[PDB]
Amino acid sequence: MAQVVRQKFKDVTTEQEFFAVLQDEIAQGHVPKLLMPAFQDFYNNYKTAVLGSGVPGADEALVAKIMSAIADRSVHEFVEPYTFPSFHHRILEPYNYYQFGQNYVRTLLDFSKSVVGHLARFDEIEQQIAAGENVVLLANHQTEADPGVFALLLEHTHPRLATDVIYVAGDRVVTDPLCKPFSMGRNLFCVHSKKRLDDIPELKASKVATNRRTLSAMTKALNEGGRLLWIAPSGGRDRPQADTGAWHPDKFDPTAVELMRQLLSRSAPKGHLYPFAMYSWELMPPRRLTHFAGTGISVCKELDVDSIVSSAAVEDKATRQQLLATAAWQAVSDEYAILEEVIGSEDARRQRSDVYQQPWA
Known about the structure:
Layout: H1 15-27, H2 35-53, H3 60-79, E1 87-88, H4 97-106, E2 115-117, H5 119-130, E3 134-139, H6 146-154, H7 159-164, E4 166-169, H8 172-175, H9 180-183, E5 187-190, H10 201-224, E6 228-231, H11 254-265, E7 271-279, E8 296-299, H12 305-309, H13 317-344, H14 346-351, E9 356-357
Parallel strand pairs: 2-8, 3-6, 3-7, 4-5, 4-6
Antiparallel strand pairs: 1-5, 2-9, 7-8
Subcellular location: Plastid, Chloroplast stroma
Keywords: Acyltransferase, Chloroplast, Lipid biosynthesis, Lipid metabolism, Phospholipid biosynthesis, Phospholipid metabolism, Plastid, Transferase, Transit peptide
GO molecular function, one term: glycerol-3-phosphate O-acyltransferase activity
């Protein structure tokens, strides 16, 4: 590599220059040496998906441009790490992390197979948000690219929902230096998982205190209204796909659903809980496998909590919380199977083109 001219990642145009810059950054102590095999693997999977996509412009120079942008932001994280606040807002200046995330995901998102279900219900959600009400999406979660899938799929009909959604996320989404730059382009509430609090017990305390501040920040934000929240009540990404047979998204933790229900209930504005289905695991099945694949999202009917839980006695909180989470999970699971059908078959999509639409087309 001694003959290769290179400066910074922002100047990189070819795969060869990319790894030469990466080599330099490692030698200068800016990034750890393990990033070379990681980016070698990542570059190879991503190159394959993009060049095989058949999309106009999806050539070697596009791949070097995207990979260099990822690398440049990773280097920035190590040299000047960002501490996520409890209520983190979309960073757009002086570096636009939103568009950074959108450009990445859009090279992998096969728009011709993708759908967004129930635009009329997204219109209702937009109406509830414009009236100052609060809306929570109880979602399955499949890839770290899901905020990009969400916004790209909704951009064309519902731009305010696509940009202003707030993701409840924590742990390596806001602590891993290689995931942070994507996360920095989204609105987040930083909520660290109960289970993973003792990975390094000196790190537990910075997480518990953050968690108290996020609870306070959410109470305040929700009492001002107009907040659209996304949360994955299973607590992480869906488990791997089944070799054969039926597959359903991971179960919803009743404690997480109850957390959202109670936050919405004690707020001054009206609150709404919607089950929300996302089909995105083909893009990046959980090292980063990447594929050019179809995706979709669809929002099920708003949950009527009193109708769902009222057969259980008000004292029996465990049962009422299990009823809400299970109703939420079952709606998501049923809509996910429709999504999986319409994205794997052009004829199934056309047959249901009244509900599962392609506003971009």
